[PDB]
Subunit: 347 residues, 4 copies
């Protein structure tokens, strides 16, 4: 019964290539590569959305609470990063088209543009790209059911929100349990006092002063971790994304990552940072290619082109910026609150 | 006005995903990845066919005679190797599927298989894989997967001039082969004979030892192989055994381009021969990346397509599928620079 | 204060390039690429040995028994896979050397060869390639190096250390969860239940079933395992094989999640090691055609023979995919066993 | 008899791994990966310099004039691209180190940093990064990080002819620019003037609508930009600001090679100009891969080298470091195929091998 071509619906996939250059009586060879490249990107965007929606659902329905499901969650998020690595490398194919050959069919593209990629916007919204923090110069380019899908993607819970809620339930944050945050503040305070005492002991000098100057900056940054009102301020400015408690959960997972219950959660947090890193690399690879194709010419979508695309390579689009910035507060191993054999048994 | 999704016919591309697991009311999540991965490979096969047919046409219609067209030829053949590099890497995506999760939807695939990939067979044929070259199982079982217009397209792909045949005819016309002109082959036989005579004298001069006795036997091996190049009867014998594919005169053209590659008229031609070897290497790396994956997916299990599975696929990782094997094997006959026939001012100007 | 160049000992690393063509009064430009490529490969071989020895020691010193060390074990084995991926890709650099430019300095290399790569042999040995299964190596070494290589053959391999760990896999104990007994029962019921279905298209369905029955029930023949094991065609003990299959089937159970990742990584390393070998083959074919190597091998022909399951140490982890069954056949796990496989 | 290990001097290469964490009696496992990764980069930087210096010399000694050398020049410049491609991908290895594990040995590194990579600075200089276009970090020149011979070597790298200067000189001699010959620049201005006039007449002829106002606006913009290409004084201004790098005549040569790339004598030259943009693109991609990894390693911590760290590195991902920016920006002035000045059989014959 089942045949390869029918199974893969190749009657659709391999009959979707219509050169506008040809339609308008001036067939240009490289337009075919241009079409295929975009169609391959859109297939992989569909796969990323399939994986991403399935992970969002595992969080939203509480399946993530059952830790049996963590291999599936980390495997699928790792799989998204493996797909994004290919999409970054895939620009190398379209770069075998010269700007001069591109120029021969560019006129037939106006006013279509990548601003009309539904799936790219769905992908951005569902990971959790800030709606206000987008570069000043998006949903205007969409109508009908597509506009509806995009609104759903903006209103439904993002991977960021769902990871946030899960980080807020991380074991060990309980003030009457392990009391991670209280102990951490106590240990950092005591650690810094002892570091100062031994800087003071040294003989007055340009070096000692440099050492005091650096200690004072590091002290201010480390203790700023414990300033909740500062966090709330930076939250409202969109410079941070995660709730204060979610930050505590993530830092708990970082410090105690070798504890069996935190091993795969540490892999997940690593994977989320990988996905942000590969999405900005996708953007910058797109940028470097567009510079060769357009120079300083305006895009068919109405943007300044090259200059606009450069502005999207920015932490404005880094959804898990907080997971990166937590590296600001790494401390000597021996300052990390100790685990009692009971804390160990629970993890 | 033109819209992105309309331009790219995404109403077809993004409505072509039907999970057979779901159609039998037992939806398996990873079947979606399986479908997208094959669909992406088939889009790229279609692009390779588009590049490959355009280059076949440039050879067939004689446009290749105008050397203005050589940048276009080498760019498109290089583009094929860049696409094949991505397709080799693309297996890393499907390797994120465990054998256990694959096993949950495999039953819904039978009897469909990669043997029913029309485009993969069109690609093999159009580069110039011959029915004889295919491993016994593959040889006849390959055409028997296709009916109607699909079978018509495969017949055409075998009946029409292959890239091998078209490159061969072009290599036969390589400037410098002309016995009345630069007479490459005559001068090469003379210089290699003279070169071997000087080498035999150098070795014969050496103080007697074990190391001399070794060099003598090694020299005698190299002399046998190098002088065998000029035995056209031996060339024809190896053609019939399928050990060589190119005509004797095309082989001479290939060596001309290798030795004189820096001559301006042979610069892009040398890039093209490099690209043809690249495409053979990447086709066989594609085959071997597929083998390594299938081994983890099936172990010793037989394929849905009817083959032994892992064991069959290993047999396709063979030089019998290497269309431009002769371009690789010409490295057997590389000689010291100072043995290569000199070009005087007259022949340099012509190139 | 520490300085970058001093820290990295670049006084050594960047003063280690001597072109033999230039030493013999005939400097060939592309020999520099040739030297750097091999040196970069050897640095990464050293890094893989560093990771692989550290993981061997975690198994051998008992620390792997502490399941808090599994993240470290899988990260380091995954790191080996990421290094090998780069090393496969790294052939693309040396392939920018034409066979004709290589031919200009090849004469200065004899009789040196890759057969004299100490680290490559150490890597093969330490993963657990056995000397009797090698395609017809220590003859190429002397003194301290021949010594290090004998140690690499005599000391516990990653295959042996993983074998011993797989034998202790929870759920195998006959008095306990009794996985192997339960699995045989369920596959026996599974097959005779399908025969009943099939016997009630119809010709080929009877043939395919008897093929499947024969193979599946052959899994339970321990005598047959020991035969193929002694004949070098299998590598893991029968109990280790049961552990592996336990981890495959129950991989989602928290305590088996990172172990499954580890089994996936061991298969990735075999796959990438053979891909390294095959990329080396594809390049050497263009460089040499049918010429014999400076090492005294047939060259291209000998290298092809190393692209075989003779060199696939974890071949058993691949072949376990032969014996995969419908998931409803897998012995159900009660709340008693489920709680034992929680962290 | 030559031995593998002796040939590759592995007695040096594989005895250069000293963990500072171990030297201070606290050995950290991942410091070994850190050291090997930097050592591999430096081996490849040396190979890039070897290729780059060989190609600089082929231009400088005048051998580039004999067009039989063009396969060698393009092969070696493409080889630099292939190496840089691997170096971009190589960051994936060091990314298998967590920020937590890096934090366990970071203390033993200060005040060493990548600001002290002689070869990275040599590479930047020899391609043609402007010293006055470099981003500052401590109000002083990057070369303050170097002393003695290293400082001298970097000075020579700044002073000696860069790849940009050598390519520039060669572009100025591009056949077809000579006003008494093919007169490319004269014909191009004439053809663009005509092209724009015929384009205006076509817009003038449409019925008054938003579509016309769009086309009139879009047209007068394209008109301004294209005609600007012929303003030599505008080019000289932008050249002094460092917004352009190539002389006006070199720019003409590059555009000649773009438009007539298929002419046999311009085929390998067009490949070279493509390779030069690839190298700019792969160097900036190296910088951004470095940036993305460093964000996870340090967050907003200051660098051992005295920079702001992540924030400073983001500022080097900039057209300040794009040496062949003019080759990219020429795509601004691409025109319809039929506007390109026609080649008669005489110039066709002079641009054949
Ligand atoms: C010759 C190749 C390409 C050129 C010249 C190009 C040009 C542009 C330009 C100028 C923009 C900004 C909007 C505008 O004014 O049009 C843009 C945005 C975009 N392009 Fe491309 N593009 C190319 C290839 C691709 C490919 C292969 C993809 C694959 C999906 C893609 C996806 C996008 C997306 C998703 C956007 C929206 C990005 C954002 O707003 O952040 N582009 N492109
Ligand atoms: C789980 C993944 C895969 C498995 C288990 C698999 C298995 C097989 C098997 C067993 C065969 C031999 C014919 C048969 O008996 O069925 C085969 C052939 C083939 N497969 Fe795959 N395959 C996989 C993925 C892919 C992908 C992604 C492609 C992409 C196009 C592909 C393309 C082919 C082609 C073209 C053939 C025919 C090759 C030849 O005859 O030389 N396969 N595959
Ligand atoms: C032009 C490039 C190369 C050629 C022609 C070449 C050739 C050969 C040949 C002929 C052999 C078989 C032994 C012999 O007869 O000499 C061999 C083995 C080997 N080569 Fe290479 N090789 C090349 C590049 C490399 C590189 C870059 C590495 C990196 C370390 C390498 C590592 C090895 C190793 C480890 C072996 C032993 C493999 C085994 O016994 O399975 N080769 N090579
Ligand atoms: C954990 C990994 C790494 C970290 C955290 C790191 C951090 C930094 C930082 C902070 C700087 C700015 C100067 C400073 O204040 O120290 C820098 C510059 C640099 N790093 Fe790295 N780096 C890493 C890996 C590497 C590697 C593997 C290379 C390989 C050569 C490298 C090469 C450089 C170079 C050349 C610079 C100077 C770049 C410029 O000025 O534009 N780094 N790095
Ligand atoms: N699985 C539990 C506990 C939990 C929440 N966040 C975590 C992070 C790491 C480990 C466990 C947890 C839950 O989802 O509520
Ligand atoms: N926006 C591109 C054109 C383009 C790129 N990708 C596309 C996909 C569809 C339609 C148009 C495009 C330009 O300005 O040149
Ligand atoms: N272009 C000419 C001459 C030619 C044939 N083969 C070649 C190989 C290399 C260079 C030139 C040629 C032709 O097609 O007949
Ligand atoms: N032949 C494969 C199944 C398979 C792989 N790729 C496919 C694509 C379409 C249909 C079936 C397949 C097997 O034996 O398991
Ligand atoms: N950690 C225990 C139990 C164990 C052995 N092998 C395993 C495999 C998976 C999970 C647990 C185990 C041990 O080393 O003896
Ligand atoms: N064995 C290779 C030469 C070779 C490859 N890699 C080497 C490293 C060191 C010494 C020699 C080599 C040949 O036969 O051509
Ligand atoms: N080879 C000649 C002519 C030349 C200069 N630049 C070029 C660019 C492309 C083609 C030829 C040239 C020279 O060096 O003066
Ligand atoms: N500058 C880095 C440390 C570093 C990265 N690479 C190095 C090489 C040598 C010495 C130090 C380094 C930091 O701030 O953490």
């Amino acid at each position: 019964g089942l045949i390869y071509g029918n199974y893969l619906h190749l009657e659709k996939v391999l009959n979707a290539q219509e050169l506008q250059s040809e339609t308008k009586g001036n067939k240009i060879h490289d337009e075919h590569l241009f079409i295929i490249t975009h169609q391959a990107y859109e297939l992989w965007f569909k796969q990323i959305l399939w994986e991403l929606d399935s992970v969002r659902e595992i969080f939203q329905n509480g399946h993530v609470r059952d830790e049996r499901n963590m291999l599936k969650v980390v495997s699928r998020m790792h799989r998204v990063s493996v797909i994004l690595k290919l999409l970054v490398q895939q620009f190398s194919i379209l770069e075998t088209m010269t700007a001069l050959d591109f120029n021969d069919f560019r006129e037939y593209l106006s006013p279509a543009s990548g601003f009309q990629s539904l799936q790219f916007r769905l992908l951005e919204n569902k990971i959790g790209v800030l709606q206000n923090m987008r570069v000043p110069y998006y949903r205007d380019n969409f109508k009908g059911e597509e506009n509806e899908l995009l609104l759903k993607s903006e209103q439904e819970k993002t991977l960021l929100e769902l990871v946030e809620a899960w980080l807020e339930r991380t074991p060990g944050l309980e003030p009457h349990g392990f009391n991670f945050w209280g102990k951490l503040e106590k240990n950092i305070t005591r650690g810094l006092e002892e570091e100062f005492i031994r800087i003071q002991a040294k003989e007055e000098s340009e070096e000692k002063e440099e050492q005091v100057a650096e200690f004072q900056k590091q002290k201010e940054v480390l203790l700023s971790l414990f300033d909740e009102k500062r966090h709330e301020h930076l939250l409202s400015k969109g410079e941070r994304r995660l709730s204060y408690r979610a930050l505590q959960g993530a830092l708990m997972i970082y410090f105690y990552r070798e504890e069996p219950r935190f091993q795969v959660p540490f892999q997940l947090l690593t994977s989320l940072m990988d996905i942000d890193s590969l999405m900005t690399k996708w953007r910058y690879n797109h940028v470097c290619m567009v510079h060769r194709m357009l120079g300083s010419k305006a895009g068919t979508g109405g943007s300044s082109g090259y200059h606009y695309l450069r502005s999207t390579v920015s932490d404005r689009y880094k959804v898990f910026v907080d997971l990166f910035n937590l590296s600001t507060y790494l401390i000597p191993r021996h300052w990390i609150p100790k685990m009692n054999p009971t804390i160990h048994k629970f993890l």
